[PDB]
Antibody, heavy 218, light 218 residues
Framework: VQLQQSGAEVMKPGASVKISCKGT????????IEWVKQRPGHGLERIGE????????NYNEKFRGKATFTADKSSKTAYMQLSSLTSEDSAVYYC????????????WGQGTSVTVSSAKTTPPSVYPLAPGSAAQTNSMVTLGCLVKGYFPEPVTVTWNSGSLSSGVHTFPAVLQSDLYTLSSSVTVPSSTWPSETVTCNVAHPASSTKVDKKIVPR | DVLMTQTPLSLPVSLGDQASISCRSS???????????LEWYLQKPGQSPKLLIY???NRFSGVPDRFSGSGSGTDFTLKISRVEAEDLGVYYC?????????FGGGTKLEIKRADAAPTVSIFPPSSEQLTSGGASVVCFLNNFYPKDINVKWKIDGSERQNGVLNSWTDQDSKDSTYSMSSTLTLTKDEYERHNSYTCEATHKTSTSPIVKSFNRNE
């Protein structure tokens, strides 16, 4: 058994989104297929299930009229017509097989990302985080390298080819006005920073942005 | 719709301890046939959920014996004997009695260890962002426990809340600590009119808030 889904989808608010569900390794049109909505914040909410054989559909009382499923008997694929989409439904969608009153939910999908916004794909903006001019030299010192104004996700902010990998921290993406802003930090001994050359590198595959930047003291 | 109530919301337990989580139904979910149909789901960060317990009186084919499930006609309890490094994740309930089907609230489950001292580090903007025309002040708080911590921004002694980006990650594996990033974005013209910028932290393991302040004109 194996399940396939469509790739990432972006669109302006108000239009429709079509996502496909492919199933193999079993009788595709013999039992229910249900989809799950996972908001990137919390909770799991379902959207509905369909039986690819007959036109038997049901919906949750909260998401009535928001999506309309569709099945195909010739090709083993399930579709979903999406109604007027708002910025409150941008979440991840899973598909799964289900058979009521008996053994059920033994497999899943892989995950499909739906990012609905109004911004435009912009290259990142890299900036160093240098400490202040007046600072007390302790036994160790922390670092910083920031990336602002990029879309869409993801981005890979690393140090010099993995040389400084212990004590790194990458935070989730959070918006400020309309775009993202992510920082990277690591702690290094204070007797090494004035000597060893360190450079933070940023890789954005969606825009093909490979930018390195050296951090120098004041 | 029959809502689930999972207790508690978060149950930090150490390695080797027995942890029990209750999942109560708002109505009776016992079917007239004589069998109650409930599913337990385990979701890991960045992966699709797995199966551990279907038909609570039974066990899934492929899960080790460390998991168990029990309960009366309405109250249900999932029990774990020895929490391992693999058992990290999020739990979910699923009722299969009435139409339609719905999920639970989601139970957060991680490991627990002793307290840690937070590491606070402030970073003023660099010369590159000044050439651009902005001011990004970053405040990292790494290696602290528990999540009970508050971050406050002061400008010349006044509380500031606009432009605050607060982000946090999950519990790391090698050190089992927490991290929190606080970013403050302002214009360069405002950076030349104020004097003192301060990141303050209040945590349980500190009787006094950790203060990190810096002045513009020094």
């Amino acid at each position: 058994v194996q399940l396939q889904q469509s790739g990432a989808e972006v669109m302006k608010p108000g239009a429709s989104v079509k996502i496909s569900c492919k199933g193999t390794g079993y009788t595709f049109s013999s039992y229910w297929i249900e989809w799950v909505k996972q908001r990137p914040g919390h909770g799991l909410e379902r959207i509905g299930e369909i039986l690819p054989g007959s036109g038997s559909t049901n919906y949750n009382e909260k998401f009535r009229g928001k999506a309309t499923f569709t099945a195909d008997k010739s090709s083993k694929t399930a579709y979903m017509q999406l109604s007027s989409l708002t910025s409150e439904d941008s979440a991840v969608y899973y598909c799964a097989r289900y058979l009521p009153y008996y053994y059920a939910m033994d497999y899943w999908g892989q995950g499909t990302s739906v990012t609905v916004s109004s911004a435009k794909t912009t290259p990142p903006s890299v900036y160093p985080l240098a400490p202040g001019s007046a600072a007390q030299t302790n036994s160790m010192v922390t670092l910083g390298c920031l990336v602002k104004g990029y879309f869409p996700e993801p981005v890979t902010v690393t140090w010099n080819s993995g040389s400084l990998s212990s004590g790194v921290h990458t935070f989730p993406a959070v918006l400020q006005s309309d775009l993202y802003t992510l920082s990277s930090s690591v702690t290094v001994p204070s007797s090494t920073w004035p000597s060893e050359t360190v450079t933070c590198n940023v890789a954005h595959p969606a825009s093909s942005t490979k930018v390195d930047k050296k951090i120098v003291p004041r | 719709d029959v809502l689930m109530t999972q207790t508690p919301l978060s149950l930090p337990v150490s390695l080797g301890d027995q942890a029990s989580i209750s999942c109560r139904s708002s109505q009776s979910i016992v079917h007239s046939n004589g069998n109650t149909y409930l599913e337990w789901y385990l979701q890991k960060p960045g992966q699709s959920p797995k199966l551990l317990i279907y038909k609570v009186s039974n066990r899934f084919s492929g899960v080790p014996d460390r998991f168990s499930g029990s309960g009366s006609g309405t109250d249900f309890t999932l029990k774990i004997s020895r929490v391992e490094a693999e058992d990290l994740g999020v739990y979910y309930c699923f009722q299969g009695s009435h139409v339609p089907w719905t999920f639970g609230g989601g139970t957060k489950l991680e490991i627990k260890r002793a307290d840690a001292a937070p590491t606070v580090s402030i970073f003023p903007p660099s010369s590159e962002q000044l050439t651009s025309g902005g001011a990004s002040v970053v405040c990292f708080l790494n290696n602290f426990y528990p999540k009970d911590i508050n971050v406050k921004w002061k400008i010349d002694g006044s509380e500031r809340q606009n432009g605050v980006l607060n982000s946090w990650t999950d519990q790391d594996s090698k050190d089992s600590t927490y991290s929190m990033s606080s970013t403050l974005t302002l214009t360069k013209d405002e950076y030349e009119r104020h004097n003192s910028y301060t990141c303050e932290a209040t945590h349980k393991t500190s009787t006094s808030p950790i203060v990190k302040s810096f002045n513009r004109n020094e």
